Amino acid sequence: DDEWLQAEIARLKGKSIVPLQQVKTLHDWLDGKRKARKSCRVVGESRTGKTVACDAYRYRHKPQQEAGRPPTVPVVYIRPHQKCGPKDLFKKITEYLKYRVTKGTVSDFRDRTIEVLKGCGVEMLIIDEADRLKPETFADVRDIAEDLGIAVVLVGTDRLDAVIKRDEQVLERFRAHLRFGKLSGEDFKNTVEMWEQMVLKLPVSSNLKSKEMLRILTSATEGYIGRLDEILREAAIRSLSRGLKKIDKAVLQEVAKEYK
Amino acid sequence: DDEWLQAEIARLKGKSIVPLQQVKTLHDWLDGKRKARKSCRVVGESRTGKTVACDAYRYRHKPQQEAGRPPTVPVVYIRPHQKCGPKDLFKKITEYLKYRVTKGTVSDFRDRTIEVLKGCGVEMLIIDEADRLKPETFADVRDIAEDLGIAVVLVGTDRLDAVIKRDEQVLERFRAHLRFGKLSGEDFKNTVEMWEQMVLKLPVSSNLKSKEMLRILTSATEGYIGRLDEILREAAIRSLSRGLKKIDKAVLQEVAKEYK
Amino acid sequence: DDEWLQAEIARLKGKSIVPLQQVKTLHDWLDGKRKARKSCRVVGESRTGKTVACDAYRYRHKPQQEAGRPPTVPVVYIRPHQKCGPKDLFKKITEYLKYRVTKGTVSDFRDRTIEVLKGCGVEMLIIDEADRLKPETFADVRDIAEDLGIAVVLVGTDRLDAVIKRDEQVLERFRAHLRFGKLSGEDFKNTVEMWEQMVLKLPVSSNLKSKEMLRILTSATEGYIGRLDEILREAAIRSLSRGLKKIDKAVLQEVAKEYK
Amino acid sequence: VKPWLFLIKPYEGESLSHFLGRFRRANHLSASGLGTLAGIGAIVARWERFHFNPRPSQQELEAIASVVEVDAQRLAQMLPPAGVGMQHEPIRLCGACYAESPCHRIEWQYKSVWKCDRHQLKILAKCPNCQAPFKMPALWEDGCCHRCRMPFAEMAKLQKV
């Protein structure tokens, strides 16, 4: 049982990807923009679940490699770090395609990145946290989207929109967006029920997501998927730590008052 | 029939040049400048079509080569990358002339640049996106214009005007300018009609570019050539994908609401 | 029994040639290059298994003892020294052949290697670690390829790609290129389940690339076939030395800890 | 541990040239290098071509004995005995005696020797298939004619009885 308890707590620590209508809409729109090389910019709140949806769109087109040619990765996902320069960005592009860099000037990195980009036949350039990179690199990404014809999706918080708004070309060229919703409603109840079924993976004690539980979770998460994940995982781990097989009212109240 | 759809979507994905009064005026202006050896600086808004028209000018009168002598390349078109240095400018200028770069310092690079430019007998130099290259290089472009007598032409957004404003010599030498227009009005209607005739290349549907779709295009694109291109191509591909033969009001309204 | 154990660990510690799909497609590619006599350059990231594939290829087409003339050698495999001049390249290419030259000078040595190459009618010249050569030697390699019509296969890592991109005339003839495989995807399952008994040759614990074993391997090898090779062999040595019947989870986690 | 070298035991009737060549190839040395190590200079490079204009002296052989670790008398036993005349050129070889033992016999270089006493074969002065004169014995990396790549042991059935 102790080994089973350790397995349960380790699984609860690990986050999962339940496919729901938000990620469904996102990757449907992503496929639509991919089929026409339309460079858009998906936007949304913080801790809402855009990156996970992007991740899923990245893994679904798992690259299929030929016997003796470079693999065809159709979707490229990068998450440049804070104040990411152009050399760093090109390094990331060529590193994702599994092409280790060689020391040189920025021009050398740009040329190698262009070469590996055309050779691999990439279709998508997903730049999450696109509010981090410097504006001297937005010209580079503009040229990438222009000459190489790769649809770029600038992903980030609403601060990304402010970052690109002060610029001239990047705002006009990247205008199509997909704002992430709050999810509050009956769809939220469906979400929490589905999370109970799959993510929690607890024995069926007929919790059924009662009205009091729904009110507590609504007051806690405020519609955030990440908040819901964190609170559910914390409640499950706290119940399993005190020997409680299922999740009762006290742990929900404790985590809710701890968070707010 | 599906292969015909593939051919149509491939043709729409590729971008063709539509002749118009503005590009003709640019052609005449550049012909006058090249016959006068005058260093001008063309300017325009975003998505107004400067790059396409400059490509049309460079493609119009190609270099007629001698059988065993270097080609008499009359026009050199480059778009140096962001924060382009003098060495990078020389590299692009020598790569356009179909002369492979020789490794060396900036002095010998500049020497060979000058030698190949004089050997090809270039008349006018056209530089796209000339708001990027660093001011350390504008001195060298001035030197080229002064000592060789080549009409140096700069393309860029209105920020290029301020870029030359902060410096004195380039502000004075590049004093002939040509602002790109908005092309809206009756000329916009003529452009729309001729785009439907030639660019769409679809079966005659008797749409005749009615007043309602003129209003929709004015409200969505606001007269930008690039925005007109984007919206018309997206509407056409959406109509063709769903099996529709002509364009519909719903498709145009959909692509309009997705842009504004 | 310890003699049998020591023989087994001697087999493990020894590098064994093992058949993969990638080596077979490389052999097909190289046979095509032989029949075309066209230069190529197989490139791949470190420890991906290029050297062993080239060695297996050259063993496949072993040299034949000729009766009327000195024996003809199909392929020449040479791994030069780091920053070694063309003199040493000629020395190695002659010494690989039965021929041998001493004294003389560089021009004499190059003439002699031309004569021995034409005498043996060598088809391909697989230079392993091509980037170890000085840039001046690359001109000599081009001259050998052009004068003898011999398909030179430049084997190395992406540093080779950067080196050949540095100079123009060297890269001029090596248009084609074969990119090696990282082996990511489902191919990992087949390669691990084959390597379980093809190479290790011990009574298997029916691991069959189990979830725990496969995930712990992907956490250490990342598709590097050499990585999994030496990891599995060293782990088997550890397991057999301590008296265990077959490998377990503890030894794998220890070797993964010492690797990552 | 004690200072060492890749020692080679001398054959029976081997040449000084061939023995020094085997010593060099097993130590990756050079004629100038071997001479400098021995302390006698480029004289070694002379001995590899049998130019004994000043016969190999007792001192010049003791100095070698110090390096190759072979007794000086055993060294003199690969030079022709005092008074016996040898021809430094052409280098001569018997195929059968090479097949028996891969070496070059100093007795083959004698002016008075034309027949292999234990094979009854007229020894070879040039390659029997392409008429290519043999190299210096020290230069025999292996037993094959340089021009035609024919093994030395094979030539036994081409050389006359």
Ligand SMILES: Nc1ncnc2c1ncn2[C@@H]1O[C@H](COP(=O)(O)OP(=O)(O)OP(=O)(O)O)[C@@H](O)[C@H]1O
């Ligand atoms: N489809 C999903 N299935 C399961 N959990 C999800 C899903 N989408 C998001 N999450 C949860 O959301 C949290 C993190 O969300 P994510 O990192 O995708 O946010 P984001 O919208 O990109 O915002 P941020 O910029 O604040 O990181 C995690 O707790 C993760 O489990």
Ligand SMILES: Nc1ncnc2c1ncn2[C@@H]1O[C@H](COP(=O)(O)OP(=O)(O)OP(=O)(O)O)[C@@H](O)[C@H]1O
């Ligand atoms: N004559 C034309 N025919 C067809 N499409 C055109 C034409 N002129 C411009 N376009 C469209 O405009 C876009 C390219 O415009 P262009 O590169 O000239 O913009 P720009 O305003 O000069 O850009 P930047 O802001 O980088 O200076 C493309 O979508 C292209 O299809």
Ligand SMILES: Nc1ncnc2c1ncn2[C@@H]1O[C@H](COP(=O)(O)OP(=O)(O)OP(=O)(O)O)[C@@H](O)[C@H]1O
């Ligand atoms: N086809 C193969 N069969 C068996 N082992 C292989 C094979 N390819 C590589 N290896 C293993 O990889 C290691 C050597 O790899 P190899 O030198 O061929 O790789 P490489 O990608 O050419 O890298 P490097 O240039 O750094 O040596 C050894 O541990 C060897 O067992």
Ligand SMILES: [Mg+2]
């Ligand atoms: Mg995020």
Ligand SMILES: [Mg+2]
């Ligand atoms: Mg433009």
Ligand SMILES: [Mg+2]
């Ligand atoms: Mg290798």
Ligand SMILES: [Zn+2]
């Ligand atoms: Zn004999």
Ligand SMILES: [Zn+2]
């Ligand atoms: Zn011969």
